[PDB]
């Protein structure tokens, strides 16, 4: 909606694993990019309803390692508001490219990221097969490969 | 449906440009891969309602350069029947890989081809921008790049 607020996560505050796990089934992988990344929390009427994690590769590129919206609040435009906020945060830290990777089966998400300016740029063959023990499925398609999209900032 | 027939196009028969143009807006590009490709026609109660073109790259790979279903008959499973038939024809000619390329904005099609066994393998940046004069748009996304998918036969 139009009355959502976004702030960085504060030390001592609970980490919204419920939300992060909607986007990444591995709590181990989440905690790893929380080490060097920056977590942001989207609040609406005092409740944390969404989040994203920015994860620098280097000076030029930073990656959205995780972006999630509470299941009760999806498909109301909150994700788009989050993506706009990520774009500003990455620009403010002088990154030149913003990257996000999603599953080959995530065809709905491939629309959304392109709507906000991401171009499809790379395929990571068997990324999910190699990095997650149990296979992952969407829409009856096995999610084996990562599709990487890139936005020039 | 279950009562569709598929046959190669016969010399002297009209070429269904109405159908081919649904899949490729350039009659010039269509006629070019009709030169070295093979056109197949799907008939239902005597009417041509779909078609595809197979276009060899070399001994190992052949490409679906064009696949189309009449607008009145779409989303009834005819395209899937066509894709199954292409797979058999390519195997029968001893190809090892079957390739199809669609637009970055064609997220519905990215589902369908993966459902029938195609993996996303390659991005052709600015393919449509370079090869078609007028820009092409889908779902409010500009169609600039070709997504190439590959099936091991
Ligand atoms: C790096 C990573 O984290 S990849 C994993 C991403 N996270 C997840 O998958 C976790 C689970 N899902 C979610 O948390 C969320 O659904 C998100 C983060 C993916 C998206 O957030 P949302 O608030 O649901 O998205 P939002 O409402 O802004 O837009 C979704 C869009 O999909 C569109 N859409 C609807 N049906 C379809 C469809 N069949 N195909 C494509 N797009 C569709 C909607 O219309 C909407 O677009 P629009 O606003 O232009 O009309
Ligand atoms: C190389 C080239 O030619 S690329 C260009 C391809 N051709 C074209 O775009 C021409 C215009 N379109 C067409 O001719 C046809 O629609 C084709 C050839 C793309 C597909 O043929 P169709 O008969 O419509 O497909 P079919 O009915 O078998 O299946 C379409 C699928 O999309 C699914 N679908 C529906 N909504 C969506 C959505 N939002 N996102 C993804 N998939 C969706 C349908 O459920 C169906 O899948 P299912 O059978 O597994 O449930």
Residue numbers in the entry:
A (entry chain A), B (entry chain A): 2 to 154
From the article:
General control non-repressible 5 (GCN5)-related N-acetyltransferases (GNATs) are a large superfamily of enzymes, playing prominent roles across a large number of biological processes including aminoglycoside antibiotic resistance, transcription regulation, protein acetylation and stress reaction. The transfer of an acetyl group from acetyl-CoA (AcCoA) to substrates such as aminoglycoside antibiotics alter the fundamental characteristics of these molecules and can render them inactive. Functional GNAT proteins generally contain six (or sometimes seven) β-strands and four α-helices arranged in a (β0)-β1-α1-α2-β2-β3-β4-α3-β5-α4-β6 topology. Here, we describe the structure of a GNAT family member from E. anophelis.
The protein was structured as an α/β protein and comprised of six α-helices and nine β-strands with a topology of β1-α1-α2-β2-β3-β4-α3-α4-β5-α5-β6-α6-β7-β8-β9. The structure exhibits two β-sheets comprised of β-strands 1-4, and β-strands 5, 6, and 9, splayed to create a V-shape. Our structure contained a well-ordered acetyl-CoA molecule bound in the active site. The interface between acetyl-CoA buries 593 Å2 of surface area and mediated by 10 hydrogen bonds. Key residues involved in these hydrogen bond interactions include Ile68, Val70, Asn76, Gly78, Gly80, Gly81, Gln110, Tyr112, and Lys116, and specific interactions are summarized in Table 2. Based on the position of the acetyl-CoA in the structure and well characterized kinetic studies of GNAT enzymes, the most likely active residues are Ser107 and Try114. Approximately 62% of GNATs have been reported to contain a conserved Tyr as a general acid to initiate the catalysis, and the positioning of Tyr114 from our structural analysis is consistent with this. GNATs adopt a wide variety of assemblies, ranging from monomers, dimers, trimers, tetramers, hexamers, and dodecameric (double ring) structures. Analysis of the interfaces present in the crystal using PISA45 suggests the protein is most likely to be a dimer. In this assembly configuration, the two monomers bury a surface area of 1464 Å, and mediated by ten hydrogen bonds and eight salt bridges.
